[PDB]
Design a protein around this ligand. Structure first.
Ligand SMILES: Nc1ncnc2c1ncn2[C@@H]1O[C@H](COP(=O)(O)OP(=O)(O)OP(=O)(O)O)[C@@H](O)[C@H]1O
Ligand SMILES: [Mg+2]
Lengths: 442, 357
């Protein structure tokens, strides 16, 4: 059955009545902030102001049955004024002629939000509690907008309840330690869900799946496909299900349950995973397994790129095997394996795999070698030590380069490595920089 | 809350009761024995000329257990004057303390001291806790070892922890050496005590080292007089900041390793790009060797020259950071929500020492 023509109206009115104008305004500040990540504090506060106005009016007893649908359209009309006081999704204009109801916004891979010190937090809270709370809901939600809405509302709510409670405490510092530890669960759930969901949003279910298999393979190289594949597939399913779900339990419930499986199956296969699984709660474990770096790879003989006739378990097997033995970050592997399996597939008939096989095998081999050079030394040394060796590398390969030029290439390369040579490098950003870096490869 | 908090340091043990705002007992981590029965702390130090001093903790890690037990027994009965079997006990450990080492601490506590419960916390994490924060990067510099520990919501990133085998004793030894090159003579146990005092009262980190050197060679605007116990008055010049400069330049003592500004920077770089901002803006300094005036400013400058230009750098160096670790233990052990974090004697009597984790 299809949702009622007025599914939205009845929803907002039901919320406005259950929460009151103040809390509904907060709910809306968070909601439109995550929806418009690039929106200034005033464009979002202004829009939120209009939304709450229409809602109050159109939900009022005796309100014209057309009200809500009429005002919301006059709201969209204003969003096309060019000199509009409202935010705007990428290319919202190419729609101002209802796509403006559900348009996409890319994830934030480099959040700028920086929680101020306790002293600064309380200094701003004293000045103006309402202001502080609003500015906070905006900046936080715009920076971690990929986390489910219920999680953002719940976290920003509990966080503010902490500031008000600790800034007026006889022992602020003591209160903050207590409150921050009780907030840990939700805080971790919120920030981590945003991150995993942003990666998911950037990749899409298919790449995401592959990505999680690659990453799990690099964390536990000495594991069996059957040990990780089910896990990589489990998280992908939780991602596609919970990242964009109004169910205020999906993520909150699913994520902790994934961690239990993670530990049940991987606890006894790696020293690091054992340590991770010894943590107190699920989220403490998840943060540990999520941050776990690519491990020292076993180093085995080369792997063959499947090119026979052939469900979908041979390519998974190959990915697993390749990644567990190739020292190259996941953003590189995901970047090349995608357009490599698109070729093998569009091949299937047999004659094809005989003219492409060698073609795909070489480019992939060439790609892998290129990345290993762009990421050379990065993982094995402290950053300052990596920069030295790098300069030593680039020097003996550019004898005519002036000390100044040399240092310019060093800075550029190391800058790239600090962003795209680790296990959780940002997909959207690195996919574009990898292209550029390869061209300049030298 | 009536738990004990003991910070087992390389040079000093800080012991007290959970809830107090300062350690009730601070004594040198030393165990001595008659040259030809057993003494601990200050006393063992005083009667040095007729004993064999031993340091159970060289670089943050307990190396000799028999001596450590003596320190703990002395901590409980002579310094605090309490029955360990009647107080939950919280102990601290170095950033990368080996699992087996922790388990041995746990075993001794329960089996030898019969504590009803205990807990082992990472020193650096407690320093962060002391400032009422659960995320940030700690620079912990004590007597024998310096560590950088990145922490996210209470989780220390093992693979990002940086170390520098250089701290307080090396700085004291080094100040003795350069003061002697100036014409004075500081080589005995006694003169060492005088130099440590000079170090802690007249030394400071220069914002700009080379310029400071030029200023010291150009005038006497940096000189400072110091009266020896015998009345002699000497003047401390560029050695005031040259001594501490060793933290940023380990090469001053023949160590070819990164300085603390680089250890901090390297540590942060080992963490994901999306959380580094919360390390840069919560760089906490703790330990006796971070007490040098001007050190926070020097660090803020160095890190700013290394981090991205749009990164907010904030150093947190409280006036009582010398005991930040102990204080974080006193607070954490006093929290009502921490009471379920203890390890009971009942639990211990199950998976043995391999229970403390
Ligand atoms: N004001 C001060 N200025 C400089 N150094 C100081 C000052 N106060 C104490 N120190 C030095 O700090 C050291 C003791 O610090 P701390 O108690 O933090 O170390 P520790 O915890 O025993 O060692 P570790 O943490 O390595 O086990 C000594 O070398 C001491 O001289
Ligand atoms: Mg210490």
């Amino acid at each position: 059955l299809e949702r009622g023509r007025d599914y939205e109206k009845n929803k907002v009115c039901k919320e406005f009545s259950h929460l009151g104008k103040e809390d509904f305004t907060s709910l809306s500040l968070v909601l439109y902030s995550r929806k418009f990540p690039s929106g200034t504090f005033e464009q979002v506060s202004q829009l939120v102001k209009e939304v709450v106005s229409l809602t109050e009016a159109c939900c009022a007893e005796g309100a014209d049955p057309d009200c809500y649908d009429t005002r919301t359209s006059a709201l969209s009309a204003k969003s096309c004024e060019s000199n509009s006081p409202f935010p705007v999704h990428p290319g919202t204009a190419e729609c101002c002629t209802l796509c403006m109801a559900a348009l996409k916004h890319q994830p934030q891979e480099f959040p700028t939000y920086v929680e101020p010190t306790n002293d600064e937090i309380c200094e701003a809270f004293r000045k103006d509690p309402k202001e502080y709370a609003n500015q906070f809901m905006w900046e936080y939600s715009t920076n971690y907008g990929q986390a489910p809405l219920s999680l953002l509302v719940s976290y920003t709510k509990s966080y503010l309840s902490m500031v008000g409670s600790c800034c007026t405490s006889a022992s602020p510092t003591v209160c903050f330690l207590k409150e921050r530890l009780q907030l840990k669960h939700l805080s971790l759930l919120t920030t981590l869900s945003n991150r995993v969901c942003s990666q998911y949003a950037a990749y899409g279910e298919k790449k995401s799946r592959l990505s999680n298999l690659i990453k799990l393979a690099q964390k536990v190289p000495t594991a069996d496909l059957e040990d990780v594949l089910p896990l990589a597939e489990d998280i992908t399913n939780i991602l596609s299900k919970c990242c964009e779900s109004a169910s205020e339990d999906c993520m909150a419930k699913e994520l902790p349950e994934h961690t239990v499986k993670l530990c049940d199956n991987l606890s006894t296969k790696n020293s690091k995973f054992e340590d991770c699984c010894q943590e107190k709660t699920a989220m403490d474990v998840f943060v540990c397994t999520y941050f776990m770096p690519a491990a020292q790879l076993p180093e085995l003989p080369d792997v063959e790129l499947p090119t026979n006739k052939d469900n979908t378990k041979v390519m998974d097997k190959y990915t697993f095997e390749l990644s567990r033995r190739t020292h190259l970050p996941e953003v590189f592997l995901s970047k090349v394996l995608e357009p490599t399996l698109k070729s093998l597939g569009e091949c299937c008939s047999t004659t094809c795999f005989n003219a492409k096989g060698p073609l795909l095998k070489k480019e992939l081999s060439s790609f892998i070698d290129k990345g290993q050079e762009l990421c050379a030394d990065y993982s094995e040394n402290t950053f300052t030590e990596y920069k030295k060796k790098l300069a030593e590398r680039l020097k003996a390969k550019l004898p005519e380069a002036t000390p100044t030029e040399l240092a310019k290439l060093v800075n550029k390369r190391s800058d790239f490595a600090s962003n795209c040579c680790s296990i959780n490098s940002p997909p959207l950003y690195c996919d574009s920089e990898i292209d550029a870096e390869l061209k300049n490869i030298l | 809350t009536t738990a004990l908090v003991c910070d087992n340091g390389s040079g000093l043990v800080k012991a007290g009761f959970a809830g107090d705002d300062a350690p009730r007992a601070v004594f040198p981590s030393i165990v001595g024995r008659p040259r030809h029965d057993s003494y601990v702390g200050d006393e063992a130090q005083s009667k040095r000329g007729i004993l064999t001093l031993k340091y159970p903790i060289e670089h943050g890690i307990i190396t000799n257990w028999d001596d450590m037990e003596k320190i703990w027994h002395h901590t409980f009965y002579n310094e605090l004057r309490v029955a360990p079997e009647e107080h939950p006990t919280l102990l601290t450990e170095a950033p990368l303390n080996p699992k087996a080492n922790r388990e041995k601490m746990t075993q001794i506590m329960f089996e030898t001291f019969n504590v009803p419960a205990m807990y082992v916390a990472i020193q650096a994490v407690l320093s962060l806790y002391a400032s009422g924060r659960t995320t940030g990067i700690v620079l912990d510099s004590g007597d024998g070892v310096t560590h950088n520990v990145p922490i996210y919501e209470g989780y220390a990133l093992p693979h990002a922890i940086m170390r520098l085998d250089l701290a307080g004793r090396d700085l004291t030894d080094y100040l003795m050496k350069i003061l002697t090159e100036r014409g004075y003579s500081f080589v005995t146990t006694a003169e060492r005590e005088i130099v440590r005092d000079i170090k802690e009262k007249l030394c400071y980190v220069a914002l700009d080292f080379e310029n400071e050197m030029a200023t010291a060679a150009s005038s006497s605007s940096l000189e400072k007089s110091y009266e020896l116990p015998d009345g002699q008055v000497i003047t401390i010049g560029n050695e005031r900041f040259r001594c501490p400069e060793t933290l940023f330049q380990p090469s001053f003592i023949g160590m070819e390793s990164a300085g603390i500004h680089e250890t901090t920077y390297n540590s942060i770089m080992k963490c994901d790009i999306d959380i580094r901002k919360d390390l840069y803006a919560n760089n906490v300094m703790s330990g006796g060797t971070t007490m040098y005036p001007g050190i926070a400013d020097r660090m803020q400058k160095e890190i700013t020259a290394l981090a991205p230009s749009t990164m907010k750098i904030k150093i947190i160096a409280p006036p009582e950071r010398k005991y930040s670790v102990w204080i974080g233990g006193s607070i954490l052990a006093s929290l009502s929500t921490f009471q379920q974090m203890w390890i009971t004697k009942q639990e211990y009597d199950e998976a043995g020492p391999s229970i403390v984790h």
